[PDB]
């Protein structure tokens, strides 16, 4: 049952590594999953729904990793605290580059994809802002910008910069440099007066 | 001659304020410009070429404004120096929100739009990096990140954050707060040690 669902998802993720969603047919997904086209439609109403499910899995993987980190703070300096958190997104989305790029494209055409991305970005920004606020309350960070506005810009920077790096866009930060680049900008803007 | 070309461009910019490019027909552009459909095709091969021309005009407007500022440095502090430069993009793209949003969408489907955007982003990043380097050479900024990598991330942050604000995305920084937000992040990350 879900084995055929997982087979469809794995086929789609593998096919997206070499071609975009518009060049993959339902017949391609069914054939790769070892089922017929009508059997595919039992599990998913469309190839777009397959991508939505793939992206939901990736974003919830990142969310759960961040939740785990929040409950188990690593015992290091403040810079490496932010690095460990940004690295959740670097590693999670960087391990699913094809789904990440396909999902970014689908945001312009899928209301469900756009709402999924917006929901989680709001959650992650609210968490960033709450950590900034806690740092200000304990006297470690200065009260400069409104924390939620700062958190919004830093999270949008990460979205755009990580995704440019993973896609090899021109221009982009090399993937092997992008974590250090983002960590520098986060730490200086959160703690700088 | 170019009056009919300008009329086509003005019609397209006005129509894009209420509907996306996929819901505007060549007949719509011709009718609004007071010409027939074949006469339209004398001036532009497609509605996509009309948008490409509109975006080229906007990006060159921003580029020329930045060039003007580079040749005529305002006499203020370092923070207001960066603010005046970021404000070129805030004001130029914020005065053409409909073309900006349509051009961003077209990047996924138009090679010419993607190459136009990439060309100018490379130019603006190289200028940012050169100013950072000059600030380091005179002892005003510390030698932290590679200047070009820092410049890349800051310019991608501005692209994503300004465009989210102009589009009213959820999440986004309010348009009335986004210049101050970006200036803070630029100044702290360029001058912070
Ligand atoms: O890039 C991020 C999230 O932004 C995104 C979102 C989607 C895609 C993407 F590529 C990046 N960083 C974050 N870090 C924290 C953090 C909180 C406490 C301690 C350490 N880090 C919280 S959100
Ligand atoms: O947002 C920017 C350019 O990035 C973009 C690019 C496209 C669209 C968009 F919305 C933003 N800021 C820049 N500022 C400078 C600057 C150089 C010296 C002194 C002061 N400013 C140089 S590029």
Swiss-Prot record, chains A, B:
- Give the phenotype of cells or organisms lacking this gene: Cells lacking this gene leads to ETH hypersentivity.
Regulation of this protein's activity per its record: Inhibited by tert-butyl 4-(3-thiophen-2-yl-1,2,4-oxadiazol-5-yl) piperidine-1-carboxylate (RF1) and 1-(thiophen-2-ylacetyl)-4-(3-thiophen-2-yl-1,2,4-oxadiazol-5-yl)piperidine (RF3).
Instruction: Give one Pfam family.
Output: TetR_N
Species annotation: Mycobacterium tuberculosis (strain ATCC 25618 / H37Rv)
- Subunit and partners: Homodimer.
**Note in the entry:** Binding of inhibitors to EthR induces a conformational change in this repressor, which is then unable to bind its DNA operator, consequently allowing for increased transcription of EthA and bioactivation of ethionamide (ETH).
Any single Gene Ontology cellular-component annotation: cytosol
**What's the stated role of this polypeptide?**
Involved in the repression of the monooxygenase EthA which is responsible of the formation of the active metabolite of ethionamide (ETH).
Q: Key word Transcription regulation present in the record?
A: yes
Which GO BP annotation is one of this protein's?
response to antibiotic
- What InterPro entries has UniProt attached to this entry? EthR_C, Homeodomain-like_sf, HTH-type_TetR-like_transc_reg, HTH_TetR, Tet_transcr_reg_TetR-rel_C_sf
The record's listing under PROSITE patterns reads: HTH_TETR_2
Molecular-function GO term, any one: transcription cis-regulatory region binding
Name the gene for this chain.
Answer: ethR
UniProt domain HTH tetR-type: residue ranges: 2-62
Q: Where is this site: Inhibitor-binding?
A: 155, 158
Protein name (database record): HTH-type transcriptional regulator EthR
DNA-binding region extent: 25-44
* Keywords of the record: DNA-binding, Repressor, Transcription, Transcription regulation
């Amino acid at each position: 049952g879900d084995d055929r669902e997982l087979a469809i998802l794995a086929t789609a993720e593998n096919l997206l590594e070499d071609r975009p969603l518009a060049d993959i047919s339902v017949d391609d997904l069914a054939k790769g999953a070892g089922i017929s086209r009508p059997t595919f439609y039992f599990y998913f109403p469309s190839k777009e729904a397959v991508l939505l499910t793939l992206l939901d899995r990736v974003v919830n993987q990142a969310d759960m990793a961040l939740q785990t980190l929040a409950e188990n703070p690593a015992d290091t300096d403040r810079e490496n605290m932010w690095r460990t958190g940004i690295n959740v997104f670097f590693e999670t989305f960087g391990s699913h580059k094809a789904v990440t790029r396909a999902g970014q494209a689908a945001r312009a055409t899928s209301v469900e994809v756009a709402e999924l991305w917006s929901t989680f970005m709001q959650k992650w920004i609210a968490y960033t802002a709450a950590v900034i606020d806690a740092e200000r309350d304990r006297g470690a960070a200065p009260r400069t910008l409104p924390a939620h506005e700062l958190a919004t810009a830093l999270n949008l920077m990460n979205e755009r910069t990580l995704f440019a790096s993973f896609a090899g866009e021109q221009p982009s930060v090399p993937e092997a440099r992008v974590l250090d680049t983002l960590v520098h900008i986060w730490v200086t803007s959160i703690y700088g007066e």
